[PDB]
Design a protein around this ligand. Structure first.
Ligand SMILES: Nc1ncnc2c1ncn2[C@@H]1O[C@H](COP(=O)(O)OP(=O)(O)OP(=O)(O)O)[C@@H](O)[C@H]1O
Ligand SMILES: Nc1ncnc2c1ncn2[C@@H]1O[C@H](COP(=O)(O)OP(=O)(O)OP(=O)(O)O)[C@@H](O)[C@H]1O
Ligand SMILES: [Mg+2]
Ligand SMILES: [Mg+2]
Lengths: 473, 473
């Protein structure tokens, strides 16, 4: 025994799976949006509004949904943002395809329409965007703040916004006639007992070591660094192992190193600087050293009051550390998850120097270009392009409907404001119900994240259409 | 206990099996055609439109269908194309035989009709086709492109089309007063990190070796090649095994070889070229060597920046390698499955120098010859030949019906266009709904694949008729 299902009934059964997976996410479309409660088989309780999190702990019985979710998860590791937008948009394009199938259009006309709209949308995003550079640091601060905000740690402590902006403004490499960065170049340190304004940047590389040995010179300058993975006969062996302590000095003097860090007593003779205990790799990347004596170099090393050790002016100038100290664990452990995602959004601007307004300002310029382009295509395909435009505007209703407003009128006001000339940045504010200019409010996101949202939605829906039949064996 | 079933009811039960197996395939008749989803017993999901793939993972309860599928699978290994056409045509000839049995004609009249139509069809294909040669490289490019297209790798990167055309235009042997080729003569290499336009031909034989030993002369010219499957007493054995390293030099000097490849250190003394590690068979076929020292010969050997090793101008000039490097695995692994099937279609033209238009242009010349021939046969057999012609035209409805068009009118327009003189290449375009000239659009397939489609369909249906009774024990 096995089941075969084919034709319109298999296509309806696939669309009813996509409109279920989108229904699970619709309400959490941020900001100012609801959370979901997830309970596991053990009885743990979790509260979340992070879509990449929900899609790993919800569980899905239907195989076509299992393909849609896999595309939306694959979407999160390539770019890091737009996990929910690429599911909502893929929900709307299917819901509006259902209106075209009742007019008896064949699916290969619809799919040819969508893949003919997406290529004029991606051109329009590159046309309406505006360029930005590292020197435009106000715009970098506005992007950081927008990605950072809506948690307890926020731009009420705007020191966090300058902290991240300065930290990646330091690490700028130049490649492809453009700037380049990666998160491997900038490191955190996390500890408890502190304050969120006590967190600081350094322009140096730092470890929260509570001890280094007391006789040693706690300031070292214009210096060389080494990073290391390095009865009667019983008394002779015991001495031979105590002489192996002096063999550390013997081989440091063989190379002239000043501070010497080893993975895992005779420290009075060394004092006549040792660090007791993947971080040696970070020190090597800062110092230019290597983990037989190969040395690295730095302008200053210090230990200072909890208690800490600092390296400053290491040979590679494009490396930075930041330290978070907070009074409770719950603050620190989510502040990392906010702060490095903010920095990893600034990096999505800096890797490609365009920026576009949030708030639904992009969708309504796209929904104008399509409705001016559709009369040129003329055939049955014209109904598929106009059915695409109605599905992109249908996104910002899910943004207005979510902040308590009346959705239809607060769509019509925006569309009428865009029929006037210029005005291209008007969109929804969400902390007051009226439309406002999104650039002067400073609400911005990088173009690469919108392009990935549009492309992963069209790729996901044109794989749910264009399945005729289901066989199992 | 056992079952016996005989007469009209056994014949109806066989035809209802053939019209089920054809019903599973009808919609995927390409291009621009739907896919099917196949789920296995483990829970893996697969999406496909390749008929030779569907028929191995669908599973079939009925024994007559199990014979039809076995003929259609056997069809794919002899010629490589026409797995679906030979099932659809075998579906139509049975569906139209059912209309003749209700007029009470006996089955041995029908089968005598079909086997009397197929012999005038095979003559007509040899009459209406047009010849082609290697020098007609535009037609080779058009055939390559038609077989290559409708994937992400396509003639948007037309470098792939010239890549394959040049690659088999080099390997041409002459036999039977005709050209001859096989796929054993041309080899690929596949690696990750690349681009689809970074893929290149060579007119040489190549391995993506990331290393060869650093002292050795990395350029060798007008050269000879060897291809090889080749306490106190403990110190004497250890030395005897180290002298066996120098015995490689000792036996290379005994034959004067310049580069020496062995299946599975003293390389400084060899340097005073060694390759560290079925490919020795390919090198032997290029070099004219053999895997006791038999040597092969080549004009140049080089190692160059990833990193690679090249052999150029080997003794046999009718051997070629191509290299695919792509930025992701998913691209490379299906690009092989497209690119070698494109090349293995050019080989189906070159092995037999006729070509015929696609798009349903052949079917409507055959459906004219039959309806002019049928009045000569005169008896009850006349109804079986005209019932054959209606079943070949009934194929291009499944091509028009599939691209969203209205099927009947877009048949009648083609038939009326063929009642005019010449025009013999008019057929369906599928990227716009009107008929167009298929030769100027460049849509071509080799005659040997159509002949195998006609012959394997008539052979499959005349075995489903002409079964009277089913016995089991
Ligand atoms: N201050 C704001 N005012 C208006 N719209 C905003 C504001 N901040 C963000 N948005 C909009 O919120 C949407 C993104 O919603 P949300 O942040 O919940 O999902 P996401 O970040 O894409 O998801 P994920 O982080 O899981 O990938 C975009 O349309 C964006 O422009
Ligand atoms: N560009 C085209 N326009 C019109 N018809 C085309 C075009 N390309 C191919 N065809 C037609 O498509 C049919 C073959 O369909 P399809 O390629 O799906 O099956 P197949 O190649 O025979 O199957 P398989 O590859 O599994 O053996 C032939 O009638 C051919 O002439
Ligand atoms: Mg976001
Ligand atoms: Mg084919």
């Amino acid at each position: 025994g096995s089941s075969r299902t084919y034709g319109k009934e298999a296509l309806r059964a696939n669309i009813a799976a996509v409109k279920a997976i989108e229904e699970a996410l619709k309400s959490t479309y941020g900001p100012r949006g609801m959370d979901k409660m997830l309970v596991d088989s053990l009885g743990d309780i979790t509260i979340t509004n992070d879509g990449a999190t929900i899609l790993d702990k919800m569980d899905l019985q239907h195989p076509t949904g299992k393909l849609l979710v896999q595309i939306a998860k694959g979407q999160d590791e390539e770019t890091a943002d737009g996990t929910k937008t690429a599911v909502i948009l893929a929900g709307e394009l299917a819901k509006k395809a259902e209106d075209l199938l009742y007019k008896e259009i064949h699916p290969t006309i619809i799919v040819s329409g969508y893949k003919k709209a997406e290529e004029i949308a991606l051109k329009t995003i590159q046309e309406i965007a505006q360029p930005v550079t590292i020197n435009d640091t106000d715009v970098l601060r506005k992007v950081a703040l927008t990605s950072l905000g809506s948690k307890a740690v926020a731009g009420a402590r705007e020191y966090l916004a300058d902290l991240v902006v300065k930290a990646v403004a330091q690490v700028a490499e130049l490649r492809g006639d453009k700037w380049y960065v990666d998160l491997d170049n900038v490191q955190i340190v996390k500890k408890h007992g502190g304050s969120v304004n006590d967190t600081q940047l350094v322009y140096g590389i730092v470890v929260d070591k509570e001890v280094v040995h007391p006789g040693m010179p706690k300031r070292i300058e214009n210096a060389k660094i080494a990073l290391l993975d390095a009865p009667t006969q019983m008394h002779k062996f015991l001495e031979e192992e105590e002489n192996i302590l002096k063999e550390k000095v013997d081989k440091i003097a063989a190379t002239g190193a000043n501070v010497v860090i080893c993975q895992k007593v005779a420290q009075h003779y060394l004092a006549k600087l040792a660090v007791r205990r993947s971080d040696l790799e970070k020190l090597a990347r800062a110092t230019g050293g290597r983990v037989e004596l190969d040395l690295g170099y730095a302008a200053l090393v210090e230990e200072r009051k909890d208690k800490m050790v600092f390296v400053e002016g290491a040979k590679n100038p494009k490396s930075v550390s930041i330290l978070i100290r907070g009074g409770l664990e719950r603050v620190v452990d989510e502040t990392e998850r906010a702060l490095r995602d903010a920095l990893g959004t600034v990096a999505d601007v800096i890797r490609d120097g365009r920026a576009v307004a949030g708030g639904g300002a992009v969708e309504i310029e796209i929904a104008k270009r399509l409705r001016k382009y559709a009369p040129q295509v003329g055939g049955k395909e014209q109904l598929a392009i106009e059915a695409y435009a109605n599905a992109i505007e249908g996104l910002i209703m899910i943004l207005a409907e979510n902040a308590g407003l009346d959705p239809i009128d607060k769509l019509m006001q925006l569309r009428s404001l865009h029929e006037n000339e210029t005005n291209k940045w008007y969109g929804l504010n969400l902390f007051t119900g009226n439309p406002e200019d999104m650039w002067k409010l400073g609400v911005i996101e990088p173009a690469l994240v919108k392009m990935n949202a549009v492309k992963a939605a069209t790729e996901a829906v044109t794989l749910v259409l264009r399945i005729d039949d289901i066989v199992a064996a």
